[PDB]
């Protein structure tokens, strides 16, 4: 995640193993139950896309759901690209590039790039955009997996 250091700057720090394991354990115990979404939300505080793929990729089991989510993440990403077209002409030397759906999904962007966008002024909330897609896709799952 990207956290604020004592000095008063935003720097990246790694997520903790008993945080990781707590994510694992939630999924083990409460599967598709709604409490998973606030839980997720708390444990995703200050998290990167990269950390969010890590969390999704580290799941075991419920592979039908994991595939449905993936496909929702790509749909929501396809929709990001649709709604926000690429911008006019070449990229400025003085500036950094606008993200695509795949940069938001973490796929085409690097960590330093993910830190550029979030730490820069104005900052862009690429975590929160992926977060809604995850929560939206979580609703899809919850609604389906209701019996």
């Amino acid at each position: 995640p990207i956290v604020q250091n004592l000095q008063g700057q935003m720097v990246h720090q790694a997520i903790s193993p008993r945080t990781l394991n707590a994510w694992v354990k939630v999924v083990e115990e409460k599967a598709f139950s709604p409490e998973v979404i606030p839980m997720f939300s708390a444990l995703s505080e200050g998290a990167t896309p990269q950390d969010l793929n890590t969390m999704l990729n580290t799941v075991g089991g419920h592979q039908a759901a994991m595939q449905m989510l993936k496909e929702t993440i790509n749909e929501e990403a396809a929709e990001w690209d649709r709604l926000h077209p690429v911008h006019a002409g070449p990229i400025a030397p003085g500036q950094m590039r606008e993200p695509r759906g795949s940069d938001i999904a973490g796929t085409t962007s690097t960590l330093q790039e993910q830190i550029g966008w979030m730490t820069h002024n104005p900052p862009i909330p690429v975590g929160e955009i992926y977060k809604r897609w995850i929560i939206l896709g979580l609703n899809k799952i919850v609604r389906m997996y209701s019996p």
Binding site: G61, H62, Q63, A64, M66, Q67
Partner: peptide, 12 residues
């Protein structure tokens, strides 16, 4: 359903 789970696990 139990089959589709098996499928995307093996596909995984």
């Amino acid at each position: 359903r139990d089959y589709v789970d098996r499928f995307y696990k093996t596909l995984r």
